[PDB]
Design a protein around this ligand. Structure first.
Ligand SMILES: [Cl-]
Ligand SMILES: [Cl-]
Ligand SMILES: [Cl-]
Ligand SMILES: [Cl-]
Lengths: 984, 984
């Protein structure tokens, strides 16, 4: 009877149909756009020969002239617009070509004139200039991320403030953890991160609204947004020649300031020849302290608070704070204030409202009925809506500046906390920003800070989109992730703690922090992670103020050896091994770092191992889908069972924990690398016993991996020990019996390849075999997928039943973080494998994948690939090519490592092992590199084609002297050194 | 330095300041309104002599003419408007009285003209007629609640659909449990129950928007809403003489229909002299199946679904369904369809959109840029936004009808479930509603169903607001709560299961259901609760599909004896005692109801008792604040410990469980009543052994309560057993040492009084003493508070510190459910106490409290008392008098019981024990009463003053015969009997 047609099962698209109906009576070009004319999909209206994919028909339908014109043909007849000469015609299925009227011709010409820039463009400094009327490619594309600065102050990760701002300034603003200053919204749309009033304001004249910052109407003649490094600037021009500018940024911390302050400066220039008597109404919504009650008890969120007014020492109203009854919601105190600067005069708000219903009245948020006559009523309840009002006359050619300060003080940074602390810190803040120029000086301080931070590594290639993308945008994102991990963004809105394994972010950022004088901050972070390791060697899976989930995931601790290795090899600072750091078990116990590193290795190499001597998988490892063992145990449980086992069987600590649990081959590689790292650290520390022990153990673990985990054509991913009849014994290579694709024998995991190489286990021949498998079965037109299709229900039960349509997340996506770990392996191998043709191929795959993740390239075909042109996104949908959020991701961290590796930089025992791998079409590469006590300018030349030091002829010079040693010294002479490499 | 002034600490209000500057220069009347002119509160603008409190200055400020005029004086000068003759003047502090201009005079006259009806009015049938422009007293005031009908079908409480509708049709619509059909909103405002698009639509003419159902602009000349029993009707008239009517109701279930369907009929009449070519765009937002991911992973909610189109057998598009990938979200299937009826023609939508971004475009939801040219694009992602479009020409004087059907099919009502089941059920639904008249016939069926249901008891007094409020509105609410408990409303939006103790709702509703032929449904509910009792006698605290929380709260099982007693005494059906019902412990074990009732009593009278032989409190009882014992145990834990104790101490089952846990005196009263009830049931069942055992146990328990819980001037609330030195031994009477009010010796709990009387434990002298304490310390100007101030930290560290400002919830509110249980006690005692002056006083308190809870009285001073004039609300704030939500409450259930009790009806062994208690000022009371096999007309007359059968002279007649027996038979002769009572 009734039938159902899904979006995916719909037989044909509008553009396919347009081509069928017109493709051989007009030239449709390389791109076109079309819409079905009715809900049964039999006819289309389209337009030919666009420069890229873009929703042109949608914009044309918003135009009353074109819309009316089309209704003489649609819906019963299909039509296509076509431009010949500089005239537009409409075409019918029967062949009639009708020259469109003059007014339709103009509208069509204006609409197509700049399609190539509809998603905006990048400045030479990598800032995104966005048109406030144009459609968005996707919900992350027009988003900026802002951060404070708590360097030099306590608990930087846990206390730095953070904000998200879209092109209209929508979004939210948080202090520590998920403490909301301006309210988050948890609703149906990814596009809605915050309550809609946040950061927005209205202008009035003669009691009538003339402007709302989140509404572009016919009275707005220009409106653009510019996302830059740690600030957003939004500009509008009215038909009445008012020029409005909004600048939004977070205040860097200073002693005595509130823990979080977001500053929004509003400049209003009267570019007309007549004075105007205006007023502003500045609005927003404070976040609730009772976040869970938004779901459970909205009335509770209202009754537990009231609004309160703030007054300076002269008795003048300055703004609003939401006042809470319960003690648990009094440990933070929010505020909003405003100063109006009008010539000589400084003034504060003259009126306010604090009840959304009274403010909107019979109107809407875009056109509030009470917006021009604020009622000065302090609301007895929440929610903490606010509106602050002030009048000002602005003379011809003059500007009025309104500075707004929104924020929160907290017990997290103050003993003996009460709202009296907020009032003192707010006074400190307002005194600091009393002089108009202080706001611009602080903004310039922010700009200069991030510019200085980025100087660790700077590309100079003349592709300015690439150079700015790396030198500014990626450098900022890696700083952002060091402080914020994966805890905040446009669509990351729930409370998330710091995952132990996300020490990875420091792998890339540590060099940046060390080269602006913050080596001690890097050490602090290393020690903070180290305090989340237990005596036995497992780790809290997550931490924030304290740690939780002891040993729940099997990979976690192993990542810490990579962090220590990177730090110690770069700085030669072995003193960190002797730091006495709290053990995660508590009871006031401390242990030297060195002994904790040994314990990490002993847990995964000796105690928590399976029948083949490889680390147990436990609940899961890096891959949360590998819920292979349904009766897994965490580390606290394992520890108790382990001591009971040693007593029952007369064992000694360090003996294996006995079980039929499955083994993680990826953990085996992380462990082998960790052991190598500790061996090299011990050698640098002149600790001969530990170096010998670790070198021997590395050899042993390598032997176990080769004997038990190489399976025909790949390193397996999991070894399975509970089927003694042999029905299943491994997952992750040919013959595993677990493929869900009839055309593939085996399941193949990208990380088995990547980590076999990064750990220096895979032989050259094993690499060649695995790369062939990757080319055939893991490399898609959108990049390297994480794994091939598997049927894990044959061995396990519940991370089962699929949740995604093909292309999304676990159903076949390109996970860009994993893709970048594979690229790290491809680069490392391309530098050293003997076979130059294997090296060439691996480098081609590396650059292919980097090209699919570089954010600036999202502006090449933005309405297909979406993403965000200044900030990474997490995955590529393999059905559509769309880059899909969230923003913060291991992608950015490993992309940074990978581009520096391709430029040739690896830090080793004796200095910089220099071995660059350029693109085949590049003939030059130039960059600068900072070190703590020296600097370098690197220049690389080569012919077109693949070239690498392993197989190509070259000449290397340092400071004008031809040298044969490709390990460049780490200089300490406070000079700039010139490195020149010329391939023959 | 900076100072802070809270809403509550603000020294003086605007009206206080208006009175101070003008109160002896003009007569400000009984009511006035005022606003501060600026943020420092030094001056005011106000208006004199209003008929009630109302936000008049707010409405005046929305008026351009009045707002401009007031700027000649404000903010520097205070002003008051005043009306002399029928002309308006403005007064200044210096005495100047200024006749205001004529345009200002007109605006002022118009604004004040109908203030007394700004919150709407009630029709004679109790329906709330609401103006769509006027402000709301509070967020529950303009709300209606809708319900389906699953009587005659399986799992009624778990499967009946339900909806919330405000005056604009905003809100949400659910199937089983918290399954969302139309999306709920969990955001900052109590006013926002649903996604804003839900139920709303636009009209277009010549490509231009002319109407949006949720926007009243200058082109709307009339706009009202009428909330009635189980439907809402919203009417608009445009300046162009279009008349638009929306009717919203839930479809009663029929075999073959979807489990949930909400029908919205839209009627568009062209009351002009020229035909109009119009189109409609009908919108909404489907609820997500992944509710938790709205908070945790919004991107997930989008990617797991796509939109799909629906087509009838002729290939015509009919609507949209959101299609889900994961199996767990495929067990319900949602739909929306639409039919346009235009003269002879029936048509279906010609276009649709399913992407919110494409629909709104550069516009707003109120003015969407894509609303008149839907794109016919099926969205590959969620959220499930929908817009259905259709054109129609409407001739002069003619009407077009658009019927919309929104709903969900479910596996909860169908084996072998898939979306094919939805398509079949939708076809059945649309075939049923093919003929235009079927919609009106179903609506009339609903109206007639609720009118017939209410006939069990009908008041006929000189007050139609009271009569309709009881006979229609309260009767509906009690039905609603029988099906929905406390699980849904404007602000009740989380998932809530059925609380065991909320069997209370059936105490009132069972008589209504029995008198429309649904006695078997009442039995089924009794058996359903009985299956949530464990063998030992404790109960699951909550249940829905299955039960949970075994014995967590100590009072739960005892309420079931009141339900069985009411049922058995009314019907004489003792057969239910022999029903074999599953025990909550499972393992396919069943037990006869009789033995389960005995076990309930044994648990609280013998096993789970403390040192005084009274029931243990456990975690808490009816009162969730009595977390006195921090090491409490649930029933499963207690049962395991109990069997171990019987073995260690050589005991027998039925012996006391030994502990120092605290005892609940309220539970002792519930238990004593339960025992009396089982004794009487056993006597009716001719079970002499059980009757004698229960009568003896009642005597024993009464003696325990009198000996151990009467403490000088009150029955205590908790006995404390863990302080062997006597430091504390009770809570709830003089001398308990636990008061937090220096002026009160002791803590007093309203329920100690109420349940001591309802259980027939309190002596007349005890009642007199407790009523005195109540008058002095529990009776406020807003009614009976639940408890006096207590400092429980002295016995239970681990506490709270309070969470509310004074007046709200636990900090001193009038909890209206508890107030009604106390009124039930006051009525019971007033009928029987020997002292007529005590009876008179208690009846006065009873009617005082009833007057404060009757919903229709919320329209007397609505901007102060708020609430909802058709539906109860939960509490009264004792600082302001505001009635605060939520809507569903034990208030309605016990109000219904109390008003019937006051009218004189109590069912006893031999019939109807008739003993009415009228108001002193009443001289007559007439009502009708239905019984299963007879009916009654009751008439009572008396002179002014207090009269009751216990102490006043009267004559009682039945069918014309004077009688002395005040127990009227329950007749079975299918005749109407006339009962006449005349007090002398
Ligand atoms: Cl994000
Ligand atoms: Cl993996
Ligand atoms: Cl509610
Ligand atoms: Cl109580």
């Amino acid at each position: 009877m009734i039938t159902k047609v899904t979006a995916r099962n719909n037989k044909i698209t509008p553009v396919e149909l347009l081509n069928q109906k017109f493709g051989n009576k007009i030239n449709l070009g390389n791109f076109a756009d079309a819409v079905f004319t009715d809900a049964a999909f039999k006819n289309v209206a389209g337009i030919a020969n666009l420069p890229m994919k873009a929703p042109v028909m949608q914009v044309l339908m918003e135009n009353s002239i074109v819309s009316k014109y089309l209704k003489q043909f649609v819906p019963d007849r299909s039509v296509s617009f076509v431009e010949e000469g500089q005239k537009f015609y409409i075409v019918l299925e029967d062949g009639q070509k009708i020259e469109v009227p003059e007014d339709v011709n103009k509208a069509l010409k204006a609409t197509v004139s700049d399609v190539k820039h509809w998603a905006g463009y990048l400045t030479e400094d990598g800032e995104h200039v966005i048109d406030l009327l144009k459609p968005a490619p996707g919900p992350h594309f027009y988003v900026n991320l802002l951060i404070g600065n708590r360097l030099g102050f306590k608990r930087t990760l846990q206390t730095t403030p953070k904000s998200v701002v879209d092109r209209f300034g929508r979004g939210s603003f948080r202090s520590h953890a998920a403490t909301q200053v301006l309210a988050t919204r948890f609703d149906m749309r990814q596009e809605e991160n915050g309550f809609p009033a946040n950061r927005q304001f209205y202008l009035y004249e003669d009691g009538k609204q003339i402007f709302y910052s989140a509404l572009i109407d016919d009275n707005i003649v220009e409106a653009t947004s510019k996302h830059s490094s740690n600030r957003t600037v939004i500009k509008y021009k009215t038909a009445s020649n008012l020029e409005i500018t909004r600048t939004i940024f977070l205040v860097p911390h200073k002693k005595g300031f509130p823990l979080a302050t977001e500053l929004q400066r509003i400049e209003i220039k009267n570019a007309s020849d007549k004075a105007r008597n205006l007023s502003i109404t500045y609005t927003g919504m404070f976040g609730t302290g009772a976040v869970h009650a938004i779901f459970e008890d909205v009335t509770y969120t209202n009754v537990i608070m009231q609004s309160a007014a703030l007054y300076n020492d002269k008795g003048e109203f300055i703004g609003i704070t939401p006042d809470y009854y319960p003690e648990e919601f009094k440990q933070d105190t929010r505020f909003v204030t405003m100063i109006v600067r009008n010539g000589d005069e400084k003034s504060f708000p003259q009126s306010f409202s604090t009840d959304y219903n009274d403010f909107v009245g019979t109107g809407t948020l875009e056109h509030p009925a009470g917006g021009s006559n604020l009622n000065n009523k302090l609301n007895r309840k929440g929610p903490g809506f606010f509106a602050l009002g002030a009048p000002f006359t602005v003379e011809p050619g003059k500007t009025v500046i309104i500075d707004t300060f929104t924020g929160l003080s907290s017990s997290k940074d103050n003993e003996n906390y009460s709202d009296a602390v907020m009032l003192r810190e707010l006074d400190n803040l307002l005194r600091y920003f009393e002089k108009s120029e202080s706001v611009e000086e602080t903004l310039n301080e922010i700009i200069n800070f991030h510019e200085n931070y980025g100087k660790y590594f700077q590309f100079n290639t003349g592709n300015k989109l690439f150079d700015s993308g790396f030198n500014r945008n990626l450098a900022f994102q890696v700083l952002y992730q060091t402080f914020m991990s994966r805890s905040f963004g446009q669509t990351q809105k729930g409370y998330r703690e710091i995952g132990f394994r996300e020490i990875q972010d420091l792998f890339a950022s540590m060099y940046y922090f060390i080269n602006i004088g913050y080596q001690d901050f890097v050490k602090e972070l290393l020690f903070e992670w180290t305090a989340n390791v237990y005596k036995m060697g497992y780790a809290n899976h997550n931490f924030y103020w304290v740690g939780k989930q002891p040993g729940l995931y099997s990979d976690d601790s192993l990542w810490l050896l990579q962090a220590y290795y990177r730090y110690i090899i770069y700085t030669k600072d072995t003193s960190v091994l002797n730091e006495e750091v709290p053990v995660a078990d508590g009871n006031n116990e401390k242990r030297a770092v060195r002994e904790t590193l040994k314990a990490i290795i002993q847990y995964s190499a000796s105690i928590s191992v399976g029948d083949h001597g490889l680390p147990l998988l436990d609940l899961a490892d890096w891959n949360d889908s590998l819920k292979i063992d349904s009766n897994s145990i965490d580390g606290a449980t394992k520890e108790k069972l382990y001591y009971e086992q040693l007593k029952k069987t007369n064992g000694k600590y360090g003996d294996r924990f006995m079980s039929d649990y499955s083994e993680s081959v990826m953990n085996a590689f992380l462990l082998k690398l960790a052991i190598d790292h500790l061996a090299e650290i011990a050698t640098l520390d002149n600790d001969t016993q530990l170096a010998q022990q670790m070198s021997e153990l590395s050899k042993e673990v390598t032997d176990r991996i080769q004997k038990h985990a190489w399976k025909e054509n790949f390193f397996a991913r999991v070894l399975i020990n509970r089927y003694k009849d042999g029905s299943y014994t491994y997952l992750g290579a040919k013959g595993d019996k677990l493929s869900a694709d009839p055309n593939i024998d085996g399941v193949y995991f990208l990380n088995s390849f990547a980590w076999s190489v990064l750990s220096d286990v895979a032989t050259d021949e094993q690499i060649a075999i695995m790369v062939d498998v990757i080319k055939k079965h893991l490399l898609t037109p959108y990049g390297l997928r994480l794994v091939t299709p598997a049927d894990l229900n044959k061995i396990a039960n519940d991370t089962a039943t699929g949740h995604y349509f093909f292309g999304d997340r676990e159903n076949g996506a390109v996970f860009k973080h994993a893709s970048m770990m594979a690229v790290a392996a491809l680069i490392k191998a391309a530098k050293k494998v003997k076979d130059n043709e294997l090296a060439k191929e691996m480098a081609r795959i590396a650059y292919f994948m980097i090209d699919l993740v570089l954010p600036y390239k999202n502006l090449e075909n933005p309405f297909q690939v979406a993403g965000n042109p200044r900030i990474s996104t997490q995955y590529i949908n393999t059905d559509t090519g769309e880059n899909i959020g969230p923003l913060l991701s291991g992608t950015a961290t490993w992309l940074n490592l990978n581009l520096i590796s391709l430029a040739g930089i690896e830090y080793t025992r004796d200095g910089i092992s220099f071995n660059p791998i350029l693109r085949e079409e590049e003939t030059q590469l130039n960059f600068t590199l900072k070190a703590p006590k020296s600097s370098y300018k690197f220049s690389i030349t080569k012919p077109v084609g693949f070239a690498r030091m392993e197989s190509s002829e070259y000449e290397l010079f340092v400071d004008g002297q031809k040298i044969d040693n490709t390990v460049i010294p780490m200089y300490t002479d406070e000079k700039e050194h010139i490195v020149t490499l010329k391939f023959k």
